[PDB]
Amino acid sequence: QTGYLTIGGQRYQAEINDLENLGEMGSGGQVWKMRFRKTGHVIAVKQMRRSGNKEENKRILMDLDVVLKSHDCPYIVQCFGTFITNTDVFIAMELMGTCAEKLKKRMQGPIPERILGKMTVAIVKALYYLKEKHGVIHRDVKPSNILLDERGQIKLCDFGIRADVWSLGISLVELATGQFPYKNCKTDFEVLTKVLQEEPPLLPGHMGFSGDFQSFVKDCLTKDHRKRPKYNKLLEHSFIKRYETLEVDVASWFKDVMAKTE
Protein backbone atom coordinates (compact mmCIF):
# COMPACT_ATOMS: atom_id res chain seq x y z
CA GLN A 1 0.00 0.00 0.00
CA THR A 2 0.93 3.69 0.35
CA GLY A 3 1.49 6.13 3.21
CA TYR A 4 3.57 3.72 5.31
CA LEU A 5 7.27 3.04 5.85
CA THR A 6 8.12 -0.51 6.95
CA ILE A 7 11.71 -0.62 8.25
CA GLY A 8 12.82 -3.80 9.98
CA GLY A 9 9.33 -5.20 10.48
CA GLN A 10 8.14 -2.03 12.24
CA ARG A 11 5.41 -0.31 10.22
CA TYR A 12 5.26 3.50 10.48
CA GLN A 13 2.45 5.69 9.25
CA ALA A 14 4.16 8.37 7.24
CA GLU A 15 3.86 11.25 4.88
CA ILE A 16 6.38 13.05 2.76
CA ASN A 17 6.95 15.85 5.26
CA ASP A 18 8.26 13.26 7.72
CA LEU A 19 11.30 12.94 5.43
CA GLU A 20 14.29 15.27 5.51
CA ASN A 21 16.02 15.67 2.14
CA LEU A 22 19.76 15.07 2.61
CA GLY A 23 20.70 15.55 -1.04
CA GLU A 24 20.77 13.87 -4.43
CA MET A 25 22.72 10.67 -4.66
CA GLY A 26 23.95 10.58 -8.26
CA SER A 27 23.65 12.12 -11.73
CA GLY A 28 21.65 9.32 -13.33
CA GLY A 29 16.09 10.37 -12.86
CA GLN A 30 16.28 11.65 -9.26
CA VAL A 31 17.18 9.48 -6.23
CA TRP A 32 17.45 11.36 -2.91
CA LYS A 33 19.00 10.35 0.39
CA MET A 34 16.39 11.11 3.05
CA ARG A 35 16.05 10.80 6.83
CA PHE A 36 12.84 9.57 8.44
CA ARG A 37 12.56 12.13 11.23
CA LYS A 38 10.42 9.90 13.43
CA THR A 39 13.16 7.27 13.91
CA GLY A 40 16.42 8.59 12.44
CA HIS A 41 16.53 5.94 9.73
CA VAL A 42 18.05 7.06 6.43
CA ILE A 43 16.62 5.76 3.14
CA ALA A 44 16.96 6.20 -0.63
CA VAL A 45 13.89 7.85 -2.23
CA LYS A 46 13.07 7.90 -5.96
CA GLN A 47 10.87 10.83 -7.00
CA MET A 48 8.51 10.50 -9.98
CA ARG A 49 7.00 13.85 -10.96
CA ARG A 50 3.44 13.94 -12.30
CA SER A 51 4.65 16.45 -14.92
CA GLY A 52 7.31 14.07 -16.25
CA ASN A 53 7.18 12.19 -19.51
CA LYS A 54 3.88 10.31 -19.58
CA GLU A 55 5.18 7.13 -21.23
CA GLU A 56 8.31 7.13 -19.05
CA ASN A 57 6.21 7.36 -15.89
CA LYS A 58 4.27 4.28 -17.02
CA ARG A 59 7.61 2.46 -17.26
CA ILE A 60 8.65 3.42 -13.72
CA LEU A 61 5.32 2.19 -12.36
CA MET A 62 5.70 -1.16 -14.11
CA ASP A 63 9.15 -1.61 -12.58
CA LEU A 64 7.78 -0.62 -9.17
CA ASP A 65 5.21 -3.40 -9.59
CA VAL A 66 8.05 -5.94 -9.87
CA VAL A 67 10.01 -4.38 -7.00
CA LEU A 68 6.95 -4.51 -4.73
CA LYS A 69 6.40 -8.18 -5.56
CA SER A 70 10.08 -9.01 -4.91
CA HIS A 71 10.03 -8.92 -1.09
CA ASP A 72 11.02 -12.61 -0.86
CA CYS A 73 14.28 -12.13 -2.81
CA PRO A 74 17.30 -11.33 -0.59
CA TYR A 75 19.29 -10.22 -3.66
CA ILE A 76 17.03 -7.39 -4.87
CA VAL A 77 16.97 -3.92 -3.32
CA GLN A 78 13.82 -3.73 -1.20
CA CYS A 79 11.07 -1.09 -1.24
CA PHE A 80 10.01 0.21 2.18
CA GLY A 81 6.93 2.10 1.03
CA THR A 82 5.53 4.74 -1.29
CA PHE A 83 4.10 8.24 -0.93
CA ILE A 84 1.58 9.64 -3.41
CA THR A 85 0.94 13.39 -3.48
CA ASN A 86 -0.92 15.64 -5.90
CA THR A 87 2.26 16.22 -7.93
CA ASP A 88 4.59 13.32 -7.20
CA VAL A 89 5.12 9.71 -6.30
CA PHE A 90 7.96 8.97 -3.88
CA ILE A 91 9.37 5.44 -3.73
CA ALA A 92 11.31 4.59 -0.55
CA MET A 93 14.10 2.03 -0.98
CA GLU A 94 16.62 0.58 1.46
CA LEU A 95 19.79 2.67 1.45
CA MET A 96 22.73 0.72 0.08
CA GLY A 97 26.31 1.91 0.23
CA THR A 98 27.43 2.21 -3.39
CA CYS A 99 27.64 0.34 -6.64
CA ALA A 100 30.31 -1.96 -8.03
CA GLU A 101 31.27 0.66 -10.63
CA LYS A 102 32.25 3.12 -7.87
CA LEU A 103 34.03 0.42 -5.82
CA LYS A 104 36.08 -0.35 -8.93
CA LYS A 105 36.86 3.36 -9.30
CA ARG A 106 37.95 3.72 -5.66
CA MET A 107 39.98 0.49 -5.69
CA GLN A 108 41.88 1.68 -8.82
CA GLY A 109 42.49 -1.94 -9.70
CA PRO A 110 41.16 -5.50 -9.89
CA ILE A 111 38.47 -6.55 -7.41
CA PRO A 112 39.40 -9.88 -5.75
CA GLU A 113 37.91 -13.15 -6.97
CA ARG A 114 36.47 -13.91 -3.51
CA ILE A 115 34.39 -10.73 -3.62
CA LEU A 116 33.31 -11.39 -7.22
CA GLY A 117 32.36 -14.92 -6.17
CA LYS A 118 29.86 -13.66 -3.60
CA MET A 119 28.68 -11.09 -6.15
CA THR A 120 28.12 -13.74 -8.81
CA VAL A 121 26.01 -15.86 -6.43
CA ALA A 122 23.83 -12.86 -5.53
CA ILE A 123 23.35 -11.67 -9.13
CA VAL A 124 22.64 -15.08 -10.65
CA LYS A 125 20.12 -15.83 -7.92
CA ALA A 126 18.51 -12.41 -8.44
CA LEU A 127 18.23 -12.98 -12.20
CA TYR A 128 16.82 -16.48 -11.82
CA TYR A 129 14.27 -15.21 -9.29
CA LEU A 130 13.11 -12.47 -11.69
CA LYS A 131 12.75 -15.03 -14.47
CA GLU A 132 11.21 -17.91 -12.52
CA LYS A 133 8.82 -15.85 -10.37
CA HIS A 134 7.91 -12.86 -12.55
CA GLY A 135 8.79 -13.57 -16.19
CA VAL A 136 11.25 -10.72 -16.05
CA ILE A 137 14.30 -10.96 -18.21
CA HIS A 138 16.94 -8.43 -17.34
CA ARG A 139 19.67 -8.40 -19.90
CA ASP A 140 22.02 -5.56 -18.82
CA VAL A 141 23.58 -6.38 -15.51
CA LYS A 142 26.41 -3.89 -15.25
CA PRO A 143 28.67 -2.71 -12.43
CA SER A 144 26.45 0.37 -11.93
CA ASN A 145 23.40 -1.94 -11.34
CA ILE A 146 25.05 -4.01 -8.59
CA LEU A 147 24.79 -2.43 -5.12
CA LEU A 148 26.72 -3.28 -1.96
CA ASP A 149 26.60 -2.01 1.61
CA GLU A 150 28.82 -1.93 4.66
CA ARG A 151 26.95 -4.94 6.02
CA GLY A 152 28.28 -6.96 3.11
CA GLN A 153 24.96 -7.29 1.27
CA ILE A 154 24.97 -7.44 -2.54
CA LYS A 155 21.73 -6.66 -4.39
CA LEU A 156 20.49 -5.82 -7.88
CA CYS A 157 18.61 -2.65 -8.71
CA ASP A 158 17.31 -0.90 -11.84
CA PHE A 159 16.42 -4.10 -13.69
CA GLY A 160 13.12 -3.16 -15.43
CA ILE A 161 12.12 -1.18 -18.52
CA ARG A 162 20.06 -16.20 -21.42
CA ALA A 163 20.66 -12.74 -22.90
CA ASP A 164 21.13 -11.85 -19.24
CA VAL A 165 24.16 -14.10 -18.80
CA TRP A 166 26.35 -12.27 -21.34
CA SER A 167 26.24 -8.96 -19.46
CA LEU A 168 27.11 -10.74 -16.20
CA GLY A 169 30.11 -12.25 -17.99
CA ILE A 170 31.27 -8.84 -19.23
CA SER A 171 30.77 -7.21 -15.83
CA LEU A 172 32.84 -9.95 -14.17
CA VAL A 173 35.72 -9.53 -16.64
CA GLU A 174 35.64 -5.75 -16.16
CA LEU A 175 35.64 -5.98 -12.39
CA ALA A 176 38.20 -8.80 -12.20
CA THR A 177 40.72 -7.08 -14.49
CA GLY A 178 39.94 -3.46 -13.68
CA GLN A 179 39.49 -2.89 -17.43
CA PHE A 180 36.23 -2.69 -19.37
CA PRO A 181 36.66 -5.06 -22.36
CA TYR A 182 35.16 -2.52 -24.78
CA LYS A 183 36.76 0.66 -23.44
CA ASN A 184 38.35 1.54 -26.81
CA CYS A 185 35.01 1.64 -28.68
CA LYS A 186 33.73 5.11 -29.54
CA THR A 187 30.13 4.15 -30.50
CA ASP A 188 27.55 1.60 -29.37
CA PHE A 189 27.47 0.08 -32.86
CA GLU A 190 31.23 -0.44 -32.65
CA VAL A 191 30.70 -2.51 -29.50
CA LEU A 192 28.08 -4.59 -31.28
CA THR A 193 30.45 -5.28 -34.15
CA LYS A 194 33.16 -6.36 -31.75
CA VAL A 195 30.85 -8.66 -29.90
CA LEU A 196 29.85 -10.39 -33.12
CA GLN A 197 33.21 -10.36 -34.94
CA GLU A 198 35.69 -11.07 -32.12
CA GLU A 199 36.18 -13.97 -29.77
CA PRO A 200 34.63 -13.50 -26.32
CA PRO A 201 36.74 -11.56 -23.82
CA LEU A 202 37.85 -14.27 -21.39
CA LEU A 203 39.63 -13.81 -18.06
CA PRO A 204 43.45 -13.67 -18.31
CA GLY A 205 45.47 -16.67 -17.19
CA HIS A 206 48.29 -14.92 -15.29
CA MET A 207 46.28 -13.32 -12.45
CA GLY A 208 45.81 -16.35 -10.19
CA PHE A 209 42.11 -16.86 -11.02
CA SER A 210 40.73 -20.28 -10.15
CA GLY A 211 39.82 -22.68 -12.92
CA ASP A 212 36.25 -22.44 -11.63
CA PHE A 213 36.12 -18.67 -12.09
CA GLN A 214 37.54 -18.94 -15.63
CA SER A 215 35.06 -21.69 -16.51
CA PHE A 216 32.12 -19.69 -15.20
CA VAL A 217 33.03 -16.61 -17.26
CA LYS A 218 33.67 -18.74 -20.33
CA ASP A 219 30.19 -20.22 -19.88
CA CYS A 220 28.60 -16.79 -19.56
CA LEU A 221 30.35 -15.59 -22.66
CA THR A 222 29.02 -18.17 -25.04
CA LYS A 223 28.31 -16.35 -28.32
CA ASP A 224 25.78 -18.86 -29.70
CA HIS A 225 22.68 -18.22 -27.59
CA ARG A 226 21.51 -21.79 -28.28
CA LYS A 227 24.51 -23.16 -26.44
CA ARG A 228 24.04 -20.73 -23.54
CA PRO A 229 22.87 -22.80 -20.68
CA LYS A 230 19.71 -22.79 -18.58
CA TYR A 231 19.55 -21.15 -15.17
CA ASN A 232 19.19 -24.43 -13.31
CA LYS A 233 22.47 -25.46 -14.94
CA LEU A 234 24.33 -22.24 -14.21
CA LEU A 235 23.27 -22.54 -10.55
CA GLU A 236 25.07 -25.91 -10.36
CA HIS A 237 28.39 -24.50 -11.60
CA SER A 238 31.31 -25.27 -9.29
CA PHE A 239 32.06 -21.52 -9.04
CA ILE A 240 28.56 -20.88 -7.63
CA LYS A 241 28.58 -23.92 -5.36
CA ARG A 242 31.89 -22.79 -3.83
CA TYR A 243 30.74 -19.26 -3.05
CA GLU A 244 27.33 -20.33 -1.78
CA THR A 245 29.05 -21.80 1.30
CA LEU A 246 32.46 -20.11 1.54
CA GLU A 247 32.68 -17.48 4.26
CA VAL A 248 33.86 -14.24 2.67
CA ASP A 249 34.00 -11.03 4.72
CA VAL A 250 32.52 -8.70 2.13
CA ALA A 251 31.53 -6.16 4.82
CA SER A 252 35.12 -5.54 5.97
CA TRP A 253 36.41 -5.49 2.40
CA PHE A 254 33.75 -2.90 1.55
CA LYS A 255 34.65 -0.68 4.52
CA ASP A 256 38.37 -0.88 3.65
CA VAL A 257 37.79 0.16 0.04
CA MET A 258 35.41 2.99 0.92
CA ALA A 259 38.03 4.37 3.33
CA LYS A 260 40.38 4.95 0.37
CA THR A 261 40.80 8.43 -1.16
CA GLU A 262 40.60 9.87 -4.67
Ligand SMILES: *CCC(=O)N1CCC[C@@H](n2nc(-c3cn(CCc4ccccc4)nn3)c3c(N)ncnc32)C1
Ligand atom coordinates in the same frame (compact mmCIF):
# COMPACT_ATOMS: atom_id res chain seq x y z
C1 LIG B 1 27.00 3.50 -9.39
C2 LIG B 1 26.10 4.03 -8.28
C3 LIG B 1 25.37 5.29 -8.77
O1 LIG B 1 25.98 6.15 -9.31
N1 LIG B 1 23.93 5.44 -8.59
C4 LIG B 1 23.17 6.65 -9.03
C5 LIG B 1 22.65 7.38 -7.79
C6 LIG B 1 21.79 6.48 -6.99
C7 LIG B 1 22.47 5.20 -6.66
N2 LIG B 1 21.45 4.37 -5.98
N3 LIG B 1 20.34 3.93 -6.58
C8 LIG B 1 19.64 3.24 -5.70
C9 LIG B 1 18.32 2.57 -6.02
C10 LIG B 1 17.62 2.62 -7.24
N4 LIG B 1 16.53 1.89 -7.07
C11 LIG B 1 15.48 1.66 -8.06
C12 LIG B 1 14.33 2.62 -7.74
C13 LIG B 1 13.07 2.27 -8.53
C14 LIG B 1 13.06 2.48 -9.90
C15 LIG B 1 11.91 2.19 -10.62
C16 LIG B 1 10.80 1.67 -9.97
C17 LIG B 1 10.82 1.45 -8.60
C18 LIG B 1 11.96 1.75 -7.87
N5 LIG B 1 16.50 1.39 -5.81
N6 LIG B 1 17.63 1.82 -5.17
C19 LIG B 1 20.36 3.24 -4.44
C20 LIG B 1 20.19 2.71 -3.14
N7 LIG B 1 19.03 1.92 -2.79
N8 LIG B 1 21.11 2.97 -2.20
C21 LIG B 1 22.22 3.68 -2.48
N9 LIG B 1 22.42 4.18 -3.70
C22 LIG B 1 21.51 3.98 -4.69
C23 LIG B 1 23.00 4.49 -7.91
